[PDB]
Amino acid sequence: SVIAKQMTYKVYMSGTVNGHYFEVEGDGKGKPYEGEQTVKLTVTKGGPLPFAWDILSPLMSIPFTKYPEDIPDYVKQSFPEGYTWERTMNFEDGAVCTVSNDSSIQGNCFIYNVKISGTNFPPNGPVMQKKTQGWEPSTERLFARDGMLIGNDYMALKLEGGGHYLCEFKSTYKAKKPVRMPGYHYVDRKLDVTSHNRDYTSVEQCEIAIARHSLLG
Amino acid sequence: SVIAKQMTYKVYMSGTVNGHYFEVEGDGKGKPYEGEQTVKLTVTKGGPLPFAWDILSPLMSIPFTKYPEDIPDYVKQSFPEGYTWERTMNFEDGAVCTVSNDSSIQGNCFIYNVKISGTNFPPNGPVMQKKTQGWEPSTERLFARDGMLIGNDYMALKLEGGGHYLCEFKSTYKAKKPVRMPGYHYVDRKLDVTSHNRDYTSVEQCEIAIARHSLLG
Numbered sequence: 001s002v003i004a005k006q007m008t009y010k011v012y013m014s015g016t017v018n019g020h021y022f023e024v025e026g027d028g029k030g031k032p033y034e035g036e037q038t039v040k041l042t043v044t045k046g047g048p049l050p051f052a053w054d055i056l057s058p059l060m061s062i063p064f065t066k067y068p069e070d071i072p073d074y075v076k077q078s079f080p081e082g083y084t085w086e087r088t089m090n091f092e093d094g095a096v097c098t099v100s101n102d103s104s105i106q107g108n109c110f111i112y113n114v115k116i117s118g119t120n121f122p123p124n125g126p127v128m129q130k131k132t133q134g135w136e137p138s139t140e141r142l143f144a145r146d147g148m149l150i151g152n153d154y155m156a157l158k159l160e161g162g163g164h165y166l167c168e169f170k171s172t173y174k175a176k177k178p179v180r181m182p183g184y185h186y187v188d189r190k191l192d193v194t195s196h197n198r199d200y201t202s203v204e205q206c207e208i209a210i211a212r213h214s215l216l217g
Numbered sequence: 218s219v220i221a222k223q224m225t226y227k228v229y230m231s232g233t234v235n236g237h238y239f240e241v242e243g244d245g246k247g248k249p250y251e252g253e254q255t256v257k258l259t260v261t262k263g264g265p266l267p268f269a270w271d272i273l274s275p276l277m278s279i280p281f282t283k284y285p286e287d288i289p290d291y292v293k294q295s296f297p298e299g300y301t302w303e304r305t306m307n308f309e310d311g312a313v314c315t316v317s318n319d320s321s322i323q324g325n326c327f328i329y330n331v332k333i334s335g336t337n338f339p340p341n342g343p344v345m346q347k348k349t350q351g352w353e354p355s356t357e358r359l360f361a362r363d364g365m366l367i368g369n370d371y372m373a374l375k376l377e378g379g380g381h382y383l384c385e386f387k388s389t390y391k392a393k394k395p396v397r398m399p400g401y402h403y404v405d406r407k408l409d410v411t412s413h414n415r416d417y418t419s420v421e422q423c424e425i426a427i428a429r430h431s432l433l434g
Contacts, residue, residue, distance in 0.1 A: 137431035
């Protein structure tokens with residue numbers, strides 16, 4: 001097993017949202033087998049960002065998911081060779097982000113290369129007016145198809161003054177070598193911003209991610 | 218007590234799928250506060266149906282959901298006046314159904330009026346070829362907006378041979394008077410066809426439904 005009980009990672013993010021180019025670099029660590037991690041992000045280009053930080057936070061570490069012994073762990077099995085993923089984020093006011101990731105390993109250090117293209121955020125909307133206050137806890141539905149893992153997740157941003165702003169995640173995770181596939185299952189997650197400077201050009205995040213069966217049956 | 222701890226209901230369904238008209242009538246009973254119910258359905262017009270029974274099974278009973286004390290029960294509070302809902306079912310092969318419900322109560326019997334319009338089921342697809350083998354248990358994500366309950370569920374039909382046929386549920390539930398709105402939460406469900414005749418003109422189903430918060434602290 002190339003995945004130690006304690007691990008670090010580096011994330012390199014680049015892309016455009018509503019035509020605004022930026023780069024973010026991150027240093028993370030955690031306990032992959034406990035589904036616990038933390039990351040320090042720096043906006044290295046195009047900060048301060050003109051859009052809500054929250055739209056980037058779930059793009060900056062699926063090896064840090066607690067899997068029980070009876071549910072094959074697609075992502076961890078992929079190492080050392082690693083995996084890629086693609087994701088679409090469909091926001092309820094019509095905006096879309098497309099994201100691609102390539103993940104690899106270097107000693108005790110995962111390396112994530114992530115690219116985002118986001119468009120059609122209304123200038124009106126809570127993303128460009130920064131009215132978001134973090135994501136609700138969520139549950140990804142996962143199942144195996146043609147040797148890839150398909151993920152779906154109904155995510156929701158909390159809005160300044162009470163309501164929610166919805167975002168549908170669709171994810172395709174692809175190991176760079178075939179691995180043992182899981183059955184139909186779920187991952188419960190909780191993602192929080194745990195620190196920031198005033199303009200969110202320096203940010204830290206905590207995540208907890210635990211796989212499980214369906215609760216009923 | 219508006220809603221008794223042992224209740225019956227009557228379901229009246231009519232609609233069109235790929236232009237085929239049909240009517241279904243049901244007698245149900247269960248324990249609304251324990252999230253347990255059974256129903257006996259008869260296809261009274263247009264039988265035998267030329268499409269998989271499974272696409273109708275989740276359209277014929279949200280009063281029968283076990284809610285814990287701390288999560289407001291939107292649907293039970295709406296009685297005796299009742300509620301309406303609208304649901305879209307979006308299948309991954311481009312098939313779609315739109316559904317509308319109106320519900321009320323009469324003594325110890327709920328009355329459900331449901332109308333469905335479905336189309337675009339391909340002739341060699343699993344619905345028109347009757348290759349489906351029931352729904353996976355699922356989890357509906359619910360939250361409050363402008364006195365209404367918004368629900369989203371990532372559903373999956375099991376197929377002959379072992380894959381899945383995905384369907385996205387989007388639901389809007391509307392109480393007929395103002396009630397105490399719940400916070401963001403989940404309902405887990407398991408729906409089984411427990412008995413049927415060969416052409417599915419007589420069918421019995423069982424359902425379990427339980428509300429909760431996220432599993433993570």
